[PDB]
C-alpha cells in the first residue's frame, strides 16, 4: 500500500456519542457549551464549539448548535441554516458553504471542514497539517489513542466525566456526575 496521510474525522451524533480523531468511542451527556476542536492548546487559529441541551426528560443531552470561529470570522449553524456573525474588515479567511444531499457542508481554505445533517450529527475533518496540534472533546490527532482523555490542564485522566467536564465553556455550568440510562 502507498503511504500518504489522510484527513482525520471527529464525530458527534445522537444523544451524546463521540468518536475522536484517533478513533475512541465514549459517551458524555453535558449541558453547557463545550470545546469540540481548537488549537488554542497551551497562539491558535480556530475553535469549534458545540451547544448541548437536554433533549428528553431522562437527563441525556444532544447537540443543537455549532459555532465556528476562524480567525475573526464567526459562523454559526443554528435552525437549519448558517448565519454569518462578525465578518472582519479585510482579512476574510476564504470559506465556502454549500448543500450536498441532506447535509450542509462548510469548507475552509485553511483545511477545516464541517459537515452537518441540520439536526444533531456533526462531522469535523482536518487536513493532515493539524497532527498533534489540536485539543478538545475530539482528542489531539496524533495517531495514538491512549492520550485522548487529556483535560484542559494537560492531565490524562481515565474517566469520561472528568475529561468532558473540563472542556465546558462557562465556569458556572454544572458537573455531570453520572451517565443516565
Amino acid at each position: 500500500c502507498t503511504q500518504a496521510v489522510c484527513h482525520g474525522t471527529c464525530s458527534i451524533y445522537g444523544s451524546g456519542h463521540y468518536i475522536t480523531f484517533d478513533g475512541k468511542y465514549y459517551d458524555f451527556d453535558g449541558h453547557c457549551s463545550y470545546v469540540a476542536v481548537q488549537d488554542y492548546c497551551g497562539l491558535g487559529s480556530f475553535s469549534i464549539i458545540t451547544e448541548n441541551v437536554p433533549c428528553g426528560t431522562t437527563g441525556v443531552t444532544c447537540s443543537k448548535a455549532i459555532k465556528i470561529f476562524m480567525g475573526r470570522t464567526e459562523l454559526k449553524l443554528e435552525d437549519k441554516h448558517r448565519v454569518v456573525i462578525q465578518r472582519d474588515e479585510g482579512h476574510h479567511v476564504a470559506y465556502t458553504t454549500r448543500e450536498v444531499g441532506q447535509y450542509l457542508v462548510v469548507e475552509s481554505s485553511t483545511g477545516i471542514i464541517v459537515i452537518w445533517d441540520k439536526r444533531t450529527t456533526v462531522f469535523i475533518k482536518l487536513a493532515p497539517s493539524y497532527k498533534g496540534t489540536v485539543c478538545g472533546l475530539c482528542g489531539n490527532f496524533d495517531h495514538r489513542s491512549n492520550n485522548d482523555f487529556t483535560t484542559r490542564d494537560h492531565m490524562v485522566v481515565s474517566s469520561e466525566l472528568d475529561f468532558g467536564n473540563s472542556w465546558k465553556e462557562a465556569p458556572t455550568c454544572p458537573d455531570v456526575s453520572t451517565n443516565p440510562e
Binding site: 453547557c32 457549551s33 451547544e51 435552525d79 462557562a170 458556572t172 455550568c173 454544572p174
Partner: protein, 184 residues
Amino acid sequence: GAVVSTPHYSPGLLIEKSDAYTKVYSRAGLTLMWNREDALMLELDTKFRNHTCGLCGDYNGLQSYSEFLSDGVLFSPLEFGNMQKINQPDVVCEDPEEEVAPASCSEHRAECERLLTAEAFADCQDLVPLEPYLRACQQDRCRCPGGDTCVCSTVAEFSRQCSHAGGRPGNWRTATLCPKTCPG
C-alpha cells in the same frame, strides 16, 4: 415554570447572569438587561417600527408625537402611565393621584451641570444629549434630600448610555461620590 441554571443556551434564546446584570438575548430582535434592583433597559431592532405599544412609546422615530398628543389633547405623563396598566384578576391596586405641582427645582442646575459634564465623560458629549439627563437630575436632588442615592442613579445611567452608543467613559466614583465595594 422550571428554574434555569445560567448561562442557558437554547437555540433561540440566551439567558445569562453576571455579577451585575441579567441578560436575555433573543433571535426575535430583543435584548433585555437588568441589574437586579432598579435599572431596566430594552433594545429592539428596526423591524418593530410603528408596532410597539408599551410604556416605552411607539417606535416611529418621532419625538413626543403620538405618545402624548393623540387627538390634539396633550396627555400628562401621569395619565399616560395609568393607561398602560395591567389588570390582575385577584388584586385591586390604586392608581397614584396627582400631587400638587411643586416648584421647578432650578436651584440645583449648577450642581448637576458641574457633576455630569466632568472629564470622565469626554467622548460621549456628541453621542448622547445633556438636556434630558440633566432635567432628570433636577428632581433627584430636591425629592431625595440628605444622602446622595438618587443623583448617582442618573449619572450611572448617563455612563450606561455613554457606553452603549460606542463610547468609553472614565471613572467618576470617588471615595465620597457614591463608592462601590467588591471583595478581593
